[PDB]
Amino acid sequence: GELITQRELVSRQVSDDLTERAATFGLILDDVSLTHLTFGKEFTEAVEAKQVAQQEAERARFVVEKAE
């Protein structure tokens, strides 16, 4: 998750390390961009199911109105 939240810091420190490593090979690195980032799907699926349970609670609330 540090790669989602701290994308920019990872990109910058990667930039520093990559610039100092590329200096030994005669290539000046103008920009260093962290661009790809993906993770397990089932985590998002579980989060969505959690939201679904919350919305089911909301439905049960409207049914509580129904039920008075």
């Binding site: 920019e8 990109s11 961009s33 962290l34 790809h36 980032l37 989060v47």
Partner: protein, 75 residues
């Protein structure tokens, strides 16, 4: 002078990104980038950016942009 007919007239682009947003919802965002080529600074374009400069340039910068800013933005 090798020429190659460089098109300083505009050529557009479009790139997308699946981001893990703030709610960690998979946010697929598209983004149409209009990058154009220069005349009195044709160099960096033509050779080492290649005739295919825009292709070499835009894709993963757009990806970084969308993922950084959408991990920052909720659904």
């Amino acid at each position: 002078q090798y020429p190659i007919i460089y098109d300083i007239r505009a050529r557009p682009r479009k790139i997308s990104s699946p981001t893990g947003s703030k709610d960690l919802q998979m946010v697929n965002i598209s983004l149409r980038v209009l990058s154009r080529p220069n005349a009195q600074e044709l160099p960096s374009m033509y050779q080492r950016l290649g005739l295919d400069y825009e292709e070499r340039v835009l894709p993963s910068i757009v990806n970084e942009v969308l993922k950084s800013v959408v991990a920052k933005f909720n659904a």
